[PDB]
Design a protein around this ligand. Structure first.
Ligand SMILES: CC(=O)Nc1cn2cc(-c3cc(NC(=O)c4cccc(C(F)(F)F)c4)ccc3C)ccc2n1
Length: 253
């Protein structure tokens, strides 16, 4: 069982704080990441969200998924995962501007599609895939998780922006935005400074990511796949088995 024996987890540095909880770098058979709910006594809705999160996490065992390690309920509700080395894909692309070679970019894409295909096969809809939720462990392996504590409308499919509108296809749209980030090094709609206007326009189908911005060395097949994933009509979007087969085919070139 994944219930960690009481008084074994040690929490060190606080590495993230929000309203959905606090994340600390801890110690439990080496470095771990510990997510805790700040309140000493929780709401029955909080206990349920904890149970639901452990229910999803305990179902996952794949190299491209952040490793769930266990949970504690005493003294506080805590979820323990592995401690990664490096930074998020968001950090690489948008903050430290890491210039990865095309072969490496296609690899990050393949590994993300690999983890997304795993989640979808286990009937897990991520609901918040974005480059911040894609960790580049040892600067080599994609680890997908939900690293947040709170939103992020750039990866939101038009029907999610409108109004349950979450599906395998809405995750595919967010994956298309990630491909856009990888192939352009940029976030979409960088020339618009109004949040509400982006929300309104994506939702109405007036605004769409500018594909003319993709790198010169970006394969023709990659540009096609990106456009397919970003289709305003969700039923028109390919699923991850097809996405992965498209990435693996163009990789042999
Ligand atoms: C350097 C380094 O390692 N930093 C680091 C590690 N961190 C780990 C967490 C963290 C995340 C969760 N939950 C999920 O990830 C989650 C939830 C729902 C669905 C899915 C999915 F499987 F659908 F993806 C995944 C639980 C507990 C912790 C400790 C948060 C921030 C963080 N920062």
């Amino acid at each position: 069982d994944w219930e960690i024996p009481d008084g074994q987890i040690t929490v060190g540095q606080r590495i993230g704080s929000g309203s959905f909880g606090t994340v600390y770098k801890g110690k439990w058979h080496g470095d771990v990441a510990v997510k805790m709910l700040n309140v000493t006594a929780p709401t029955p809705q909080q206990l349920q969200a904890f149970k639901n999160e452990v229910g999803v996490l305990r179902k996952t065992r794949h190299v491209n998924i952040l490793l769930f390690m266990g949970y504690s309920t005493k003294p506080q509700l805590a979820i323990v995962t592995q401690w990664c080395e490096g930074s998020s894909l968001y950090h690489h692309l948008h903050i430290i501007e890491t210039k990865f070679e095309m072969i490496k970019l296609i690899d990050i894409a393949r590994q993300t599609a690999q983890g997304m295909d795993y989640l979808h096969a286990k009937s897990i809809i991520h609901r918040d895939l974005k480059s911040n939720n894609i960790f580049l462990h040892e600067d080599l392996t994609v680890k997908i998780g939900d690293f947040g504590l709170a939103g992020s409308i750039l990866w939101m499919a038009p029907e999610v922006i409108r109004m349950n509108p979450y599906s395998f296809q809405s995750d595919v749209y967010a994956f298309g935005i990630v491909l856009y980030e990888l192939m352009t090094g940029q976030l979409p709609y960088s020339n618009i400074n109004n949040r509400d206007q982006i929300i309104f326009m994506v939702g109405r189908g007036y605004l769409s990511p500018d594909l003319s911005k993709v790198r010169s060395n970006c394969p023709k097949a990659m540009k096609r796949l990106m456009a397919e994933c970003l289709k305003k009509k969700r039923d028109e979007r390919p699923l991850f088995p097809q996405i992965l087969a498209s990435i693996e085919l163009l990789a042999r070139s």
